[PDB]
Design a protein around this ligand. Structure first.
Ligand SMILES: FC(F)(F)c1cc(NCc2cnc(-c3ccc(C4CC4)cc3)s2)ccn1
Length: 203
């Protein structure tokens, strides 16, 4: 039949392409859906979408009709305008940043992972709007690598996360599979080949 797969906006495009490619190799019919991780898990939970597989970074252990696995990792950066107040410290820390405002994603309840670090916050609905605001000094934010690679190699934006996690904040990328699919050798073959290829990318 059709299998439907969700991937969030934090999943780098090489990642999304690698997954899709393997699925079409080991599945007949593949429909791809994209949402922000908060709406990633909410969306699969709605049950009206008939999402069979979801690849996101948001964590929830007991979900109905869905099991969990780790598919790999992605990296994320705390970014902010170079002339944002914060940049002048040179040694920025989660306490030093809790005073200044965070553009954060939120689309009503919130997960722990995507919980805001600050009392002064502003919710945005996608990453492009987050970064437009950040680039206007409105606040600071947590964005994926693939999104801000260019604005950081261009000096447009800066990084404050090189004390917390040098190199980027290594987040897990989870695969939330529908329970039934566990019994299809196809799902397992997808899983094997994907996990391998993604690690091969990591080099
Ligand atoms: F889409 C992703 F870009 F992948 C993503 C990843 C993500 N990880 C959980 C975290 C939340 N706050 C963190 C943090 C870690 C270090 C700092 C230091 C002070 C600068 C601040 C906040 S890490 C959350 C949202 N979005």
């Amino acid at each position: 039949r059709n299998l439907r797969v969700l991937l969030d906006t934090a999943i780098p495009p090489s990642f999304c392409d690698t997954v899709s490619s393997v699925l079409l190799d080991d599945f007949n019919m593949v429909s791809l859906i994209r949402t922000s991780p908060a709406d990633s898990l909410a969306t699969i939970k709605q049950d009206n979408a008939e999402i069979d597989i979801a690849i996101t970074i948001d964590e929830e252990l007991k979900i109905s009709r869905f099991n969990q696995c780790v598919l790999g990792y992605t990296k994320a950066f705390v970014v902010a305008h170079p002339q944002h107040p914060l940049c002048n410290a040179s040694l920025h820390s989660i306490a030093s940043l809790a005073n200044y405002r965070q553009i954060s994603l939120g689309s009503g309840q919130h997960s722990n992972l995507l919980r805001p670090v600050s009392d002064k916050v502003l919710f945005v609905e996608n990453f492009d709007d987050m970064l437009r605001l950040v680039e206007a000094g409105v606040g600071w934010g947590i964005a994926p690598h693939y999104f801000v690679e260019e604005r950081l190699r261009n000096g447009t934006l800066a990084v404050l996360s090189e004390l917390y996690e040098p190199g980027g904040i290594d987040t897990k990328v989870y695969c939330y599979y529908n329970t039934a699919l566990e019994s299809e050798r196809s799902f397992l073959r997808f899983l094997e080949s994907a996990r391998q290829r993604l690690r091969q990318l990591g080099r």
